[PDB]
Amino acid sequence: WAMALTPMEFARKYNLLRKDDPVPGEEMTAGIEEGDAKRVFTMQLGPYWDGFERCSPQAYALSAVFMARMNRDRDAANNILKVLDKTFVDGKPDFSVARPVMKKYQNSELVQEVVAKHAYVLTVIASLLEAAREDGVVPSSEFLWLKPVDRRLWYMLNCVGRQTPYSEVAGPFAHWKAEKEMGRRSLVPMIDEAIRALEIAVKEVRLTPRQMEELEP
Amino acid sequence: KGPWAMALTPMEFARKYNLLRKDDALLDNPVPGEEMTAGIEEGDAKRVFTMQLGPYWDGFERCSPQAYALSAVFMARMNRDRDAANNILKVLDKTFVDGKPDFSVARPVMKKYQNSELVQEVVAKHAYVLTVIASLLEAAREDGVVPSSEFLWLKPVDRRLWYMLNCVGRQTPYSEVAGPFAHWKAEKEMGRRSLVPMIDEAIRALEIAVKEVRLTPRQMEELE
């Protein structure tokens, strides 16, 4: 199973660590290259929302599920989930099953309110899931097949309801939270909370002498 | 092709394990409706399907952790304990989000039901882990739907078990579990467990599936 990177693993994967320095108790600790971190987190944000037709198939179909739930149509929702489970078992899932439900609910009032308030596919669909959860539980485990289909989406949706995201979606999570705080959609990335949380998490972790000697300035 | 590759079709299976050969009955006496098809090397096929049977059942403690935990879920259902079952499935689901799974969660349930009458009856009648657990799933389904959906998490941990369990309730199995499927059915038809592999039906079925597929001339010449 393909585990989420820790903060330190993430920093190391994207070459974000830096010789910081001398804060007593911070011996054998690294800093973060903020500019590079900004770029990584900006890339994580993914595409602008620009009509559901342009979402990936998986983002489209799960959006449809959540919209159906927002509109109290559990049957339409469970039918997608069921076909996707069955057809995913059978070897490649039928994301077209969601199209009728998209057509019915994409301009419904509650959906239009979510789309109006978020600029990115990932922040739109997070708020669709948050909103669907006023109807019922809607766990990650209704859509287990998404992990191998779309890792970034899987992690974003598993962070809805959580206070701290996985580092691999900390950018879109920070942005989503910033959009809610601003009370409008934002095209300008608002990912500064991801940078500060990475720095904090990375400074908790001691490096080996070998690791410290690798730190570039 | 990754931990999530699609199931091999019969023809792909026969090619991966080098089971295709020239059909010497059709070479020496051709039939007009049957040109351009291959036969199966039956010796090698018996080996491959026997290799799919997996280990003998020899107490649940010796099963793979996934086989242990799913047996426990099915056991609970056979004994009408949906909550103990669902508790395992919940906890397993939780751990696959980001981590590695808590198969430990199944231990209390296995303790409680492994010597229950209905479990004892399944274990008595099947000799292999795969055939026991197939029958436990089949029995668990008298209590409710127990779809494979709910353990999609299995496919990356144990390909063979996942396909085996998705064939319970099917008439034709995937080629990659045709051996233990054939065995399982043979046990049910004999009315006892069988340690001797009973996989001949998987060989017959492969030959029949392979005869449906026309090869190209180039493919026909490359046969041995």
Numbering used by the authors:
A (entry chain A): 159 to 179, 185 to 380
B (entry chain B): 156 to 379
What's the publication's text?
Further binding studies were conducted with several DotM mutants, where Arg residues (single or double) on the protein’s surface were mutated to Glu. M3 and M5 were unaffected suggesting that they are not involved in Glu-rich sequence binding. The Lpg1663 and the consensus OSM peptide was also assessed for binding to the M1 and M2 mutants and binding was found to be also abrogated. Remarkably (given that acidic Glu-rich motif-containing effectors represent only a subset of Legionella effectors), the M1 and M4 mutations resulted in a significant decrease in L. pneumophila replication in the macrophages (up to 70–80%). However, in A. castellanii, M1 reduces intracellular growth by up to 90% (after 24 h) while the slight reduction in intracellular growth of the M4 mutant is not statistically significant. We observed that the M1 and M4 dotM mutants producing the reporter fusions Cya-CegC3Cter, Cya-OSSCter, or Cya-Lpg1663Cter displayed lower levels of effector translocation compared to the wild-type strain of L. pneumophila (Cya-CegC3Cter: 50% and 30% decrease compared to wild-type DotM for M1 and M4, respectively; Cya-OSSCter: 50% and 40% decrease compared to wild-type DotM for M1 and M4, respectively; Cya-Lpg1663Cter: 60% and 55% decrease compared to wild-type DotM for M1 and M4, respectively).
The T4BS secretion coupling complex of L. pneumophila comprises the inner membrane AAA+ ATPase DotL (IcmO) and two inner membrane/cytoplasmic components, DotM (IcmP) and DotN (IcmJ). In this study, we determine the crystal structure of the cytoplasmic domain of DotM and observe large patches of basic residues, leading us to hypothesize that DotM might form the recruiting platform for Glu-rich motif-containing effectors.
